[model samples]
Target: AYFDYTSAKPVDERILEAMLPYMTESFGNPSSVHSYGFKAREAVQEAREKVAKLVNGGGGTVVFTSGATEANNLAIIGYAMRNARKGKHILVSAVEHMSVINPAKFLQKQGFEVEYIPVGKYGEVDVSFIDQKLRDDTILVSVQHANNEIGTIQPVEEISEVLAGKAALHIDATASVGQIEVDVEKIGADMLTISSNDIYGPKGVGALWIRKEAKLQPVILGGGQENGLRSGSENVPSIVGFGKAAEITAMEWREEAERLRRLRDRIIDNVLKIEESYLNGHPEKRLPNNVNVRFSYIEGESIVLSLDMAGIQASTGQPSHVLMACGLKHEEAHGTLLLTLGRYNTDEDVDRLLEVLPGVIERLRSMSP
Candidate 1:
């Protein structure tokens, strides 16, 4: 099984089909004042509406950026800088992607007091801890809707309740958007980040959805596109593909999630039957497509290489700040591997994994001193 869906997914042919026209016959700058420009601009606006609908944008505007990393930078640093007078303090989840963490750190260098809220054993944000850390001067709070590495879903709704009228909340819904039902209104976020590629869309485009009331400065400056927040000529083809992906996801996600959850659990259930193997992340509160696990007495890198030799693609060896933030000991951290499912995976793929993985582990342990 190609189980590195967290890294990237194969784009849907339908999304590609939707993108072809923009790339070929309809190449026009969204800013030029001509019929060609009007056509390109129309496509981009339609894509914006599609993305907004997927997230329950609720009167918010979508600012298309180069990718989610830029979206995170805009949402965190741009918002913080623009609203600095409201407060100088901000909070982010400990398990956030480096996109969020780095921007938060950038804010730290800019004289904002940034605090990281810790998570529980399952990689969930402790709302009570956020309550304890919430200061009168705390102007922003950001937590991923679900973690990419560990797959634990955070308590954003509950955290929102805790932050009501206290601080601006931002949820990076990159991991959770397609696999779960994500309503920005329900999550009560002031701003949110989402990636096109995460849902089988194009790689070079993403958006920061800002609630009508929320205010943020422009991180990128140029032609003043994307409502003047992301000021670059839009990637029309990618944006069109992204909108198509969002549309398909909106229609097919619930059923697709059910299918992937079944396959995911099959892998999780059978893999954990191996001796010394343990499930990681929240057992039930994780993403439907993720199954992170650990096997004792073996380094995960060895298992990954052995599995690769046997024609299975899996992820390991990278030091997971997510796991470490969840209190995994160094040994436990080094022994974990990630198996993320996607639209292309089948029951046959799960069977192959189940058949090959234990043998891979067995071979690795045998090689150990």
Candidate 2:
């Protein structure tokens, strides 16, 4: 079993097929002014629309970038800098990936007042506290739609209303795009970040959605491309593959989500049967594919290594700032394990995990004197 989809996924074969021609004979610089360039440019535009449609709230412009991290940096830093005269303060959930957090921190160093939003015990963002925190100078607020480690979905839609037009809301939807509905308009996001590979697309491709009226300064300066928000020649092959993945996920993800949810719940139910094992994150509001659990009296690294030695792959919890943001102690954070399911998993895989994991935990505990 390979249950670390949050970390990576094999590129879908359909995505690969869509990208192959672009990588070879169809190759041309999207910025070029010839037949070959036209062909490549056309494909790039189509891919951009596909990504836009996948996150379509009402309407927005999708700016392509190297990956979600760059997209996030652009969304956070670019927007904040360009709009600094409007407001020099911003808020970001403490559990955010380093990409978002680091950029926010950088702004703090630039004399912007960056506040860290606290999450609830189950890793949920504190939406109710928004009004008290909102200041006229709050230019931006960012919260992930779903956590990569714990899988708890944040209430970006509700937070949107709480901002009450006082601040632009940015959502990092990378972990939730393929596993759930990520309608940008529905979530009321002014800007959103998404990773192509998170939905089985090629790596090295992602996008930032800026609501039509929203403006951002370009972070990567060069020959203007991607509406001048992102610079440089487009990665045609990866972008094509990303679009294919987004289209397929838009068409098929609901059914896929239900199947994975069932398997995820099965593992959750079984794993907790082992003494001292407990689930992390919200019980009902989590992503369909996530199952994070902690076991007392043992290290998550030990369980991860044991599972890997037995031919299964899963991520270890280690000392996560995500867990730390949710008020977990270092020992508790280090004792958790992350198991995220994906399209290739099946009932058999769930069964195998259930059968093998308890023994792994028991064995580790036996030697833990």
Candidate 3:
């Protein structure tokens, strides 16, 4: 029940080892042409390339940012603000993570028209519905590669197919990349936002993959560093560690996903064996590691506390606004438990939880509704 890969990972040892040299000894401005600067610059490029390889995007398309939040802002606001004349109508899915949704709100406040596409009960947007939504004024269509709560995977490639060579299509792939299949060109996305935390790397490192010929402008103005896209001193250690982590996710995805899928299924299978239990997301169209379940009568928070007391870590849902202004929430979003697994978790960890969760739920249902 350690379901929070959407927040961050357990950190990879190789990633830590890769970042050690650049911290105290190799610190220098990546902009300078001196030997120290070149050292930092090489690390920067190497990280960028590793991130790019994760999506099969060219290194030139990947630009670093503080994290997925900045990358999301830059991708949505940067393009919308820059191309204001190309119809302010921005198209985004209904269930998008707040990273893109918040910026889309910013665009609307700034006088751009925003449109939300409907999602079916499966928590997926109807790709066939795009043609009617893609107006001549449609500026961009932004969607996530997967869902944070339901664990439903979107057919981004289909959306890309519908919008192909037409309006600009952007994907907030914060949850999909490194864990599942996501290649930019094949998916038909013009720009993509990715984060380091999703794949066992620490936070504070993310990038926006803008197609080479994308029609966009920079949002963060400064000395034009990051080749004028993201202007500021790049983080040396975290980004390097992030790169190491990204390389590992890309290389080990197949084997890692298989392991995670088994873990996720174990949770679902155990729950289904109990009466009044229902699974929320599509069975197969989900992240191998993500499992979101709602027990019939118990509230999510009370169960979370019970697990915490049992030494099992988990999240009730996306926290309060102060917890994260950009995260998603629901009206009685109480029964929702997000139990995402990371690679570090073992069968033993899952088994221990299986032994405890049913008892916890039975006690809660007996006492409360």
Candidate 4:
């Protein structure tokens, strides 16, 4: 049982088939002028259009990058650098991925004032916090669509309502894109990040969708690729894979999400039945594929190791920053387990986990002081 879908996903066979030609006979520099180059550029454009359509980027364009981390950096640092004259303050949710958090920290060193909007006990950001923190000089606000650890979905629409066009909004939708509907226009996001591996596409490629009016300085300077926003010879094969993944996701995500939601709930319900076990994140407002729970008096690392010996793989951690931001103490955070389901997970896999987990928890708690 592989339960760490949030960490990475295997590329879908259909997406792999789509990418093979680009890596072999059709390989060419997208910036070149030859026929081969034209073919590659055409594939890249088709992928861009697919990604844009999936996110409802009606008034914007997509800039391909190495991964979601780069996209987040480009959205945060790039936007702030280009528009600093307009304002020197920014707001970000406290539960955001480090990709978003670190860029805000970088900006702070550059003299821009950055504030982290507080989240609730379930890891949901409060709209009122953003309302109170709004400043005339605030230039950008960044919040993840869903947390990678706890899987709590943020109220992006409500946050947009609070901003009301006062500042640019960037959403790191890397964790939410294929698991839920992510519409840039609907969310009123100025920029958004999408991850390839998270959507069952090839790794080493992801994209940032920039609204027509959103301006960002180039983060990587060379060859002026991605319309001067992101510069590098395009990773043609991976981009094609990402495009195929987005195309398939647009068609299949809803049904796949529904199936995973059932399995997720089953796992959550069974796991929480154990002694001293508690669910983390919002019960109904979390991602469809995620189940995070904490067990008292036992370290999650021990459980992870014990499960590994039983041939059931899952994720555990150091005190997670996301959980800590939700007001969990160090011990509580360290005792968490994260299980994110994917396309291939089935009811039997969930059964295997449920059958194996309680015994492991009991053994660990019995040995604990």
Candidate 5:
């Protein structure tokens, strides 16, 4: 049974069917002047509309990129670099993915002052922190809608209200888009990063939605594609797949999330019954498909290996900066087990995991000298 859905997801067959023609018969650069080019451009435009609708980004422009990492870099580096003249200061959530964090660090080297907004014990960023940190020149604030590691959904709406347009709010909704509500207008986000693979689309494509009023410098230079924001020939096939996935999610995600939430809660409820096991992240305010738990005496690496041996594929490792940001100690962070469910998972899969996990944990605990 595959439990590491957050790290990767299989492309939906329907999305693949939509993309096949783009890769073979309809393969043409959107920039070409020929009939083939016009056909490709039309497909790309339709896909863009689908992606925009998924996030309620009708008021914004969707710029296609290679993946989520590029989107984050573009939103952070592009926005900050372009608007640095207004103010060289920026704020980012400490619990954000490295893609966001690294770009902030790059800006720091470029003479930008970056401050990390701290999170609470549940990995939720407080609006007060933003209120305190706001400055005359704080050009951007980057925060993820939900964490990929522990699955704690941030208080993005509250954070946005606090910023109140003082700084451009860039939300990396890579983990939250398909699993929960992520309307850019509702969140009041100036920029948002979304991954195609996270929604069961092709892996090579993602998008950054930028509100029309927000301005950004191009990060990838050349050909002046993506309205001069992103360069290079578009990944037509993957973008088409991404659009199909978004359309499917917009229609089906609510029902799928409800089903996954039940399985997630069952996993958490049963796992915590183990002597040393404790749930990570906000129990009720977490992603519907995520289950993260830590054991007292055993390392997560051992648990992951043991589960794999039992033919259940889960994920764990890296003292997890997100856990540390939530105030967990180094040792506490090391014992985490992260299981993210997906569309293909079933109740029987959860049953198999429940049957195998306790014995593995007990054995690992006994062997921990």
Candidate 6:
């Protein structure tokens, strides 16, 4: 109902048109032996290629999943079980999404050691620190591309390049995939995850691309789907929707991002018009549509609820949508709002929200705790 792309996006109409046939008329189990199934299977595989191409344009094999969450589990757990002979220790960033963190913790209970690479104040993980942390027992190093709470884009490719001779690299590009560039091969990550819901597509669809060299062990066992790594009846329609939506987004990314950047700046500019407001994250490196601001002396939830009542949808810093769970009282992460622009947003939408926010902020500040 609000600006919650970090959680999911409103599906685009253009994508819906592409996915309509598969749901009703063209319903076919992708693994079936019939001609209908073969056609559906081909479409699914083409969509897999599209998923890989979204970032790397590689004809790499893509294992489709219900969403990025599953992809994260697949990459981390699958890699762990497969490469256990190589090492029993794994490294992920402190700023990474729960999807990565939780699975790593699960591995911990199984006797594998886990390490967290602490990030700097700017929210970017320092690759310089990773070298020392890379022990002989380290098997995988995972990090997210752009942080959800602060909108900080990490130098993942740089980190991968630095760790080239070291442990295998896995990137959680769920938040940054279509909003920004994520050419995986160029980024040099051995494993990458991209979700459809983040980019104006339906939920329950995502892709996990494993590099040809990354030796991954199967975490799930059953009928062979996704090179038998993930076993299940393939979801044909939703997967098609993911590919179609991604294709459209890739073609229109630059222009749409430029448009979003203007709206984002408008939000920032309006917020800056207030006396006690501060912008978080690296100014230039952030996602173009994201505008996160710290409003002094005003509770973010208070402001966010007020905005919602005004028929203007937005979110607070401690929103559940954030990759890292942000608490409403974590000052550095709280009393802040995350306003993300979308292709559907307009100048009028920005203007309306802009018109409502200042008054809301002032009202909250006048009665501040």
Which model scores highest in lDDT? Answer: 5
lDDT of 6 by residue, 11-42 (tens): 99988888999999888998889998988998
What is the alpha-carbon lDDT for the whole of candidate 3?
Answer: 0.80
- RMSD of candidate 3 to the truth, in angstroms, is 3.1
**How many clashes show up in model 4?**
0
Model 1 clash pairs?
none
The lowest-lDDT stretch of 10 consecutive residues in candidate 2 is: 53-62
Q: Where's the lowest-lDDT run of ten residues in candidate 5?
A: 316-325
lDDT scores in order? 0.90, 0.91, 0.80, 0.92, 0.93, 0.80
Clashes of each: 0, 1, 1, 0, 0, 1
What tens-digit string does per-residue lDDT give for candidate 3 at 308-331?
999888876544321122232442
1-369 per-residue lDDT for model 5 (tens digits): 889998899999999999999988999998999999999999999999999999999999999999999999999999998998899999999999999999999999999999999999989987798999899999899989998888889888988888877999999999998899999988999999999999999998999999998999999999999999999998899999999999999999999989999999899989999997888889889999999999999999999999999999999835788899899999999998999999999999999999999999999989988
TM-score of predicted model 1? 0.98
* All candidates: CA RMSD (Å): 1.0, 1.0, 3.1, 0.8, 0.8, 2.4
Q: Which segments of model 3 are wrong by more than 4 Å?
A: 318-332
Model 5 clash pairs are none
Q: Which stretches of candidate 2 lie above 4 Å from their native place?
A: none
> Could you give candidate 1's per-residue lDDT for residues 16-94 as a string of tens digits?
9999999889999999999999999999999999999998895798989888999999999999999999899999999
Better of 3 and 4 by TM-score: 4
